[PDB]
Amino acid sequence: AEERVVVISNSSSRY
Amino acid sequence: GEYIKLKVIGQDSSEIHFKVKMTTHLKKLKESYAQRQGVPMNSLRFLFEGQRIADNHTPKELGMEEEDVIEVYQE
């Protein structure tokens, strides 16, 4: 397997 | 603060690493891991030093550091 690194990161509303 | 990198070890010894902040609620890691494994999140339990990681636990609360390991087992 290859290395796997995952990064965990209203007025415009119309509906 | 800086991201820390956590290693998540599966039952098959595969690994997915996650960068999280010390204040990140670990539910976000659990959901991403379960998504990438293609299984329901509630089918898994996530352990740090053998203790269950709650949805609202953060790395700060658990005393986690860079390159700490989380193990995933079946619920």
UniProtKB/Swiss-Prot annotation, chain A:
Query: According to the lineage, what is the superkingdom?
Result: Eukaryota
Origin organism is: Homo sapiens (Human)
Q: What does this protein do?
A: Functions via its association with PML-nuclear bodies (PML-NBs) in a wide range of important cellular processes, including tumor suppression, transcriptional regulation, apoptosis, senescence, DNA damage response, and viral defense mechanisms. Acts as the scaffold of PML-NBs allowing other proteins to shuttle in and out, a process which is regulated by SUMO-mediated modifications and interactions. Inhibits EIF4E-mediated mRNA nuclear export by reducing EIF4E affinity for the 5' 7-methylguanosine (m7G) cap of target mRNAs.
**Gene induction:** By interferons alpha, beta and gamma. Up-regulated by IRF3 and p53/TP53.
Self-association and partners = Key component of PML bodies. PML bodies are formed by the interaction of PML homodimers (via SUMO-binding motif) with sumoylated PML, leading to the assembly of higher oligomers. Several types of PML bodies have been observed. PML bodies can form hollow spheres that can sequester target proteins inside. Interacts (via SUMO-binding motif) with sumoylated proteins. Interacts (via C-terminus) with p53/TP53. Recruits p53/TP53 and CHEK2 into PML bodies, which promotes p53/TP53 phosphorylation at 'Ser-20' and prevents its proteasomal degradation.
Q: Where is this site: Breakpoint for translocation to form PML-RARA oncogene in type B APL?
A: A1, E2
Stretches for region Sumo interaction motif (SIM) = 5-9
Q: How does the record describe the protein's post-translational processing?
A: Ubiquitinated; mediated by RNF4, RNF111, UHRF1, UBE3A/E6AP, BCR(KLHL20) E3 ubiquitin ligase complex E3 ligase complex, SIAH1 or SIAH2 and leading to subsequent proteasomal degradation.
Can you name this protein?
A: Protein PML
Annotated compartments: Nucleus; Nucleus, Nucleoplasm; Cytoplasm; Nucleus, PML body
Q: Which disease is it linked to?
A: A chromosomal aberration involving PML may be a cause of acute promyelocytic leukemia (APL). Translocation t(15;17)(q21;q21) with RARA. The PML breakpoints (type A and type B) lie on either side of an alternatively spliced exon.
Domain comment, as recorded: The coiled-coil domain mediates a strong homo/multidimerization activity essential for core assembly of PML-NBs. Interacts with PKM via its coiled-coil domain.
Provide the transmembrane region boundaries.
none
Curated annotation (Swiss-Prot), chain B:
Residues in cross-link Glycyl lysine isopeptide (Lys-Gly) (interchain with G-Cter in SUMO2): K5, K19, K21, K27, K28
Residues with site note (Interaction with PIAS2): F18
Q: Which GO terms describe its biological process?
A: cellular response to cadmium ion; cellular response to heat; DNA repair; negative regulation of action potential; negative regulation of delayed rectifier potassium channel activity; negative regulation of DNA binding; negative regulation of DNA-binding transcription factor activity; negative regulation of DNA-templated transcription
Question: Molecular function terms in GO for this entry?
Answer: enzyme binding; potassium channel regulator activity; protein tag activity; RNA binding; small protein activating enzyme binding; transcription factor binding; transporter activator activity; ubiquitin protein ligase binding
Which cell locations does it reside in?
A: Nucleus membrane; Nucleus speckle; Cytoplasm; Nucleus, PML body
The cross-link Glycyl lysine isopeptide (Lys-Gly) (interchain with G-Cter in SUMO1) sits at: K7
Q: Gene Ontology cellular component?
A: cytosol; glutamatergic synapse; nuclear body; nuclear membrane; nuclear pore; nuclear speck; nuclear stress granule; nucleolus
Its post-translational modification remark reads: Cleavage of precursor form by SENP1 or SENP2 is necessary for function. Polymeric SUMO1 chains undergo polyubiquitination by RNF4.
Organism superkingdom: Eukaryota
Using the record's annotation, list all stretches that form the Ubiquitin-like domain. 2-75
Q: Which residues carry this modification: Phosphoserine?
A: S14
The entry's keywords? Acetylation, Cell membrane, Chromosomal rearrangement, Cytoplasm, Host-virus interaction, Isopeptide bond, Membrane, Nucleus, Phosphoprotein, Ubl conjugation, Ubl conjugation pathway
Ranges where the record places region (Microbial infection) Interaction with Tula hantavirus: 1-7, 19-22
How does this chain assemble?
A: Covalently attached to KCNB1; UBE2I increases cross-linking with KCNB1 and PIAS1 decreases cross-links with KCNB1. Interacts with SAE2, RANBP2, PIAS1 and PIAS2. Interacts with PRKN. Covalently attached to a number of proteins such as IKFZ1, PML, RANGAP1, HIPK2, SP100, p53, p73-alpha, MDM2, JUN, DNMT3B and TDG. Also interacts with HIF1A, HIPK2, HIPK3, CHD3, EXOSC9, RAD51 and RAD52. Interacts with USP25 (via ts SIM domain); the interaction weakly sumoylates USP25. Interacts with SIMC1, CASP8AP2, RNF111 and SOBP (via SIM domains). Interacts with BHLHE40/DEC1. Interacts with RWDD3.
Family according to the record: Belongs to the ubiquitin family. SUMO subfamily.
Indicate the disease this protein is implicated in: Non-syndromic orofacial cleft 10: A birth defect consisting of cleft lips with or without cleft palate. Cleft lips are associated with cleft palate in two-third of cases. A cleft lip can occur on one or both sides and range in severity from a simple notch in the upper lip to a complete opening in the lip extending into the floor of the nostril and involving the upper gum.
Q: Output this protein's name.
A: Small ubiquitin-related modifier 1
Query: What is the native source organism of this protein?
Result: Homo sapiens (Human)
**Whole protein: which stretch is covered?**
19 to 93 of 101
